[PDB]
Amino acid sequence: GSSGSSGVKRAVQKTSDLIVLGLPWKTTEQDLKEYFSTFGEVLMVQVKKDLKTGHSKGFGFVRFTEYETQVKVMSQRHMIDGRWCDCKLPNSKQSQDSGPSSG
Numbered sequence: 001g002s003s004g005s006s007g008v009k010r011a012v013q014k015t016s017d018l019i020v021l022g023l024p025w026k027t028t029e030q031d032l033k034e035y036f037s038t039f040g041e042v043l044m045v046q047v048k049k050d051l052k053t054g055h056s057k058g059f060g061f062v063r064f065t066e067y068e069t070q071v072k073v074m075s076q077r078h079m080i081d082g083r084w085c086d087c088k089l090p091n092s093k094q095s096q097d098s099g100p101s102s103g
Contacts, residue, residue, distance in 0.1 A: 015063065018061070018062055018064075018070055018089060019059060019062075019088055019089070019090050020059055021058065021088065022058060022059075022083060022084045022085045023047070023056065023058050023059055023085050024058075025055055026081060028056075029045050029046055029047045029060070036064070039069050040064060040066060041066075042063075042064065043064055043065045044062060048060050061096075062087070074089070
């Protein structure tokens, strides 16, 4: 079958906001700051929540002070409150709107 890639999308870039998927509800922005702070120092913390049910979307945005910290974070996984969470970079697929919002 057709399968096999040589050198995945690799482009030079500096520290950037990382999106976390598989986050619990109990865990909030304030809690995430303390948890993530364990790796070093939290530079940015945010938790996305729905408006239909009010329950967290299960994902949010976070940024570390050191690029090495954020990079090493995305490399390995982390168990928050016994829940499985993964850190990945935001792609075109998900483009959170801001300021100028049509509507």
